[PDB]
Amino acid sequence: ANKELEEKNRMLQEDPVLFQLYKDLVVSQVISAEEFWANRSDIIESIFRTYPAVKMKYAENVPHNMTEKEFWTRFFQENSNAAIIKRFNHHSAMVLAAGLRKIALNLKKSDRYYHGPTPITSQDIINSFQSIRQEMEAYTPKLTQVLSSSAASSTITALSPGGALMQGQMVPNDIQSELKHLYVAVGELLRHFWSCFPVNTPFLEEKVVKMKSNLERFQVTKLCPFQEKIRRQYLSTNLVSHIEEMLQTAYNKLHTWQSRRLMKK
């Protein structure tokens, strides 16, 4: 069965981003599209599930030279007294049947938390203690001692934007959408490329797919710089270099892990 074709038809226009990126991977003819998917009323329904007799009657009386309004009409249509009680008992039983279809912790080193990841003679204490004890025999010098005009002016100049302690562009708009779309494409493909990269996966069938994805990295990064070139030759302003870091770091991881694999071999 063409289940893949049916799914592609379903998602062809319902979701714009998914098909946009999947098509983009083929617009420049990067790779085959197989890997793309390889890696990744109420009343009548209630009656249908309630009355098996109604189900059989519907199957035998499927609309044929009749009308659904007439079928609806057929629904509602001491001997009668006991029939009502029996009907409730049977109906509740049918509803119920339809609903029933088949370590104390111990530690040896706690001061490590007291000094967590945050990083980092005797007569001196005596001298400082006595000196500070004798320091404050006089108090309330606020009248002049606390502040001076020259120091205040220096502080205000420092607080000025050009002073110390106080250091002090949305021109492009349409380029924003293109950058977002490119970032989404990079994320989409990096997801599969990094899906099993961190795990060692020392198996033949597991490593085959990482090798294929690593080649796909070369093949996609082949086309990325061409769009980069198109965008660059406009104004030579507002450089977009963050995208380069992702590609270069992915390449560095690829090559370093290749060398590590060769060393392990």
Add this chain to the structure above:
Amino acid sequence: MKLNVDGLLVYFPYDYIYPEQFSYMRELKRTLDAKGHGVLEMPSGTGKTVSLLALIMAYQRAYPLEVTKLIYCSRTVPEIEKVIEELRKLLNFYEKQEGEKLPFLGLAL
């Protein structure tokens, strides 16, 4: 759980008894001591069976000649099965307390 009933000391399997159980046991012991037919009512569906059985067993131990045996009747067999379960639990508790088997027989027809 050994209860120092006014008449005698009576064993009891569960940990605690409500005051209504004390009243039930004392009234029942009064009736047995009088050796006269009587009627009494207790609310709980369960618990009355264990209290009654324990008191009757203790009275039998104290005055075996006074009472030859107990004939405990229930409405239905499914119900009397629960009674025999309660009696089995009580006998196991008493046997553990005594440390050995005693000449006591209990059965349902």
Add this chain to the structure above:
Amino acid sequence: LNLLVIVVDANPIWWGKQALKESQFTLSKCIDAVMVLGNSHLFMNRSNKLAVIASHIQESRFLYPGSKDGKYELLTSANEVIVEEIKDLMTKSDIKGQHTETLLAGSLAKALCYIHRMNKEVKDNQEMKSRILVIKAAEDSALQYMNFMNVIFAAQKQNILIDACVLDSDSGLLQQACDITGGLYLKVPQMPSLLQYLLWVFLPDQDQRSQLILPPPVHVDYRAACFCHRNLIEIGYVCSVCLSIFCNFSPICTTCETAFKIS
């Protein structure tokens, strides 16, 4: 209204080192500047209230729960009480060589629970916007990180702003602390002119802080390190019990003793 709390780090070791150095700045002038700041804070409005805490190596003590010079009676009482209590605390103090690092986490905990008590007692009609103007004066202690982080998170939940005013040293823990709760961080390099910094950067309350230009926040280095040799690490291997940042993959982390199963 606003409830201000000044947590002064009056470390005798460091301030007495300054006294021995005979530098221009002194603990007396620091206390006077803090006093002036509190007086101005209450001067702002009647409903506003303040409190003061002093830190020492042993413990931390509150410095605050006619018109002889023609003075406002309430501020006169504040001046007298703070002066007397600070002199008493500095004059009387035991000596313990083993413990010399200044204590700040306990003082901040006292401040937080004091603010909670005041918030409970105050009438529900008026809303109180409390603040803690921490004034550090000495290097922090490594062993206090955990408790200080606890109190910082409690302050974040309770909506109190920790405005740090470190001087003579940049405490990474304290800057991290104020960054979490959004309090301002000012490092005054001119100690003699410290009070001008208070009457501008710190004095304005949270109500008007947004609608005012103040020095930009300093970048915070949220570093992580393994528990072995104490060094920056970008990737940490924590477990589900210790929640501890470690060096490298190990059969079992020492602080856990758990029976980790390989895979």
Add this chain to the structure above:
Amino acid sequence: VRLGMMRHLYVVVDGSRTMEDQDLKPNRLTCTLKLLEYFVEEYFDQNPISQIGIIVTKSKRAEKLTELSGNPRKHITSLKKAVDMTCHGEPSLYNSLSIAMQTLKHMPGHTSREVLIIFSSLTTCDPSNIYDLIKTLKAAKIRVSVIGLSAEVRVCTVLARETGGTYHVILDESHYKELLTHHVSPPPASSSSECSLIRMGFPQHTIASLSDQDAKPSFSMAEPGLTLGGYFCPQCRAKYCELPVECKICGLTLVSAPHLARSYHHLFPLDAFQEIPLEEYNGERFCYGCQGELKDQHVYVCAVCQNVFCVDCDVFVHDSLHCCPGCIH
């Protein structure tokens, strides 16, 4: 007692029409959502590494209102949107638990998978028997702790006790607050629970290097404008607006040191302080914690520092600060 610091929790809300009944002062559904907003925010504030997910079940169908995420604001917005939900239909425990199981099956073993079913309508119409699903839940070690409303449901009682969770029924709104606040805290790890090391990454906030030289412009990663500076990743190298967040590429959790430090108080619970009403030779009128006179005949003391704390001081310390001020010294 071993505790699972990292837990993926699903708050299953039922959009039954029994929720229409205004048993509580406001509408039942509105009250549950309003309080569940607070529950979500507090849960994130008390377990940053953990993440939450909401499944809304109505008309015999369960829909994922919000997938697993580390951002409380997104879930809060989802709650506010759901406040206006029609609230008509009948819930299906099988459907809701199956959706939760499908999402949680691929979750890492080390993390604790948990479900909190806020059950309102006692009925449970399901396509398949739930006793069979109970076996799969036990096999998958997914803790399920139901909170019933106005009903002691037997199927949910057996669900909770068999799967290891706890069952409760709302006595009133105040007790509802207490129940959810209790469920906020991490549950103790039982014998079936297992612990394993989890890869973690610690990013550093970065800005323009020097006067916007060799800048690193970028918009966001899950209408974001250009950002001069922000967080980054050791491996993704993709700008992240806020932390903590799971990597969109690596699959590794990015989280800073304070977020981890926020959970140490769980490992270090504070021992309850004995309450002595009488003064007991406590001549200090001022409470040490708050330096205020003790206006009530109550005092609290530790077993180490032996300090004095009033009712408010002790309550606050054991509730929020989670550490004794004087006893820190």
Add this chain to the structure above:
Amino acid sequence: YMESTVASWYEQGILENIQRNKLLFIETQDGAETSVALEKYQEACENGRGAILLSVARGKVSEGIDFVHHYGRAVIMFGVPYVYTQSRILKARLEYLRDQFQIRENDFLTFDAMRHAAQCVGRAIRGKTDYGLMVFADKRFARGDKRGKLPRWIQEHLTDANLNLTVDEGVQVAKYFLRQMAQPF
């Protein structure tokens, strides 16, 4: 009488609303149907659907069955249980008791009603201290004679404040009492 009431509720919309709120099961003279209905009722009680079991006080099911925790939580009594005043066997049984042992006919009739009601309403308190409420939807029970002949344990719990509650007031107090009993000891 049960059939007549059920038929009236069916003609009105009350019965459909009851069906929506909770499952409904009814008793019949035939033992096989009674057993099947009760077997399904137990499963309904175990599940969250719930069940409303309509039965007759003289029905063998009422005497045979025992209701425990999460079974027959709220026992509803619709009307004082009285035997038909035409069955001639009871006429001999009753007039003979009047002639000998000197029991008034009304006295014995009310005794036969109260004993039967106590039998059919006393099941919810089986054991293990399982909460539950017994609501009697009949002003006759409010009469002093019925209360006096009621068993002591039920009567002493019964109070004048809730003796003759309106339907709505009874519903509210039942909700509050269930709230109180929900919480642990």
